Write a protein that binds this ligand. Structure first.
Ligand SMILES: NS(=O)(=O)c1ccc(NCc2ccc(B(O)O)cc2)cc1
Ligand SMILES: NS(=O)(=O)c1ccc(NCc2ccc(B(O)O)cc2)cc1
Ligand SMILES: [Zn+2]
Length: 257
């Protein structure tokens, strides 16, 4: 019953998921002036050439584009990481208006949306085991601003009318997630959590500095999705973001000067 309404939204989550008030929760605000350049950080290595997308699912919170994670087909390495992390799914968080929607913020600025490419450390064997570990996941976060269309997003936008309501899924083969990346792979990183219940503290966050641009029309189509199931009262899927959480005993690291 958690969600994003007044009665079940982020300020309520702690009642069922007490780690919501934990020591390494996400998202956070990234203060660009107080992030520390870390010369030990390596370039990201994003290897998505053999990615195999399978399906797109409206899960009642967002939509997930799911991948075949039974082999190292689409992996993230390098950066702050000391293992190989398989891509399992990506999804977005977005607003009702262009002035909100991102989870992370930058000098307190919200973006219109945020893309999360979710990867799990292969040494743990499955995603469910990985989320139990302090280094189980690596989530690659990418901000979306509204301006020119993102060509590589359009295939996603166009299928959304077929997964309008909670529990719908559709085929989604042969999608190339490389078309969602910005040019630069400069990033910030810090230890954090899942941003939805169960809010587990298992994520090495890697947030790219350079946003991608999407069109107003693309993000308008995100906002036509529904949180509800078919045959239930229509609740638009908008404002499915958790606000910034206390930084606590963390300093964010920058890959760039
Ligand atoms: N956030 S949580 O602690 O898991 C939680 C919060 C609320 C509830 N139940 C009450 C509730 C559930 C859903 C909605 B709604 O607008 O769709 C409103 C009220 C159940 C669990
Ligand atoms: N928004 S986010 O921090 O990227 C993010 C939030 C939640 C999730 N996964 C949610 C979740 C957690 C555990 C299991 B399981 O199989 O035990 C399945 C799904 C994945 C990413
Ligand atoms: Zn997310």
């Amino acid at each position: 019953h958690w969600g994003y309404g007044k009665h079940n939204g982020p300020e309520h989550w702690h009642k069922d998921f007490p780690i919501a008030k934990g020591e390494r929760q996400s998202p956070v605000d990234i203060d660009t002036h107080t992030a520390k350049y870390d010369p030990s950080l390596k370039p990201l290595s994003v290897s998505y050439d053999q990615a195999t997308s399978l399906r797109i699912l409206n899960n009642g919170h967002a939509f997930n584009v799911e991948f075949d994670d039974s082999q190292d087909k689409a992996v993230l390495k390098g950066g702050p990481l000391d293992g190989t992390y398989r891509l399992i799914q990506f999804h977005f968080h977005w607003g009702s208006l262009d002035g909100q929607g991102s989870e992370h913020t930058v000098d307190k600025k919200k973006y219109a949306a945020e893309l999360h490419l979710v990867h799990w450390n292969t040494k743990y064997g499955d995603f469910g085991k990985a989320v139990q570990q302090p280094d189980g996941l690596a989530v690659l976060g990418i901000f979306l601003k509204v301006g020119s269309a993102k060509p590589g997003l359009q295939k996603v936008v166009d299928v959304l009318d077929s997964i309008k309501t909670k529990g719908k899924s559709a085929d989604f083969t042969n999608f190339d997630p490389r078309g969602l990346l910005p040019e630069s792979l400069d990033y910030w990183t810090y230890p954090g959590s899942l941003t939805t219940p169960p809010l587990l503290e298992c994520v090495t966050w890697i947030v790219l500095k350079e946003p991608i641009s999407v069109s107003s029309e693309q993000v308008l189509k995100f906002r036509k999705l529904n949180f509800n199931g078919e045959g239930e009262p229509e609740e638009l899927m908008v404002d499915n973001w958790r606000p910034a959480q206390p930084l606590k005993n963390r300093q964010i690291k920058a890959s760039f000067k």
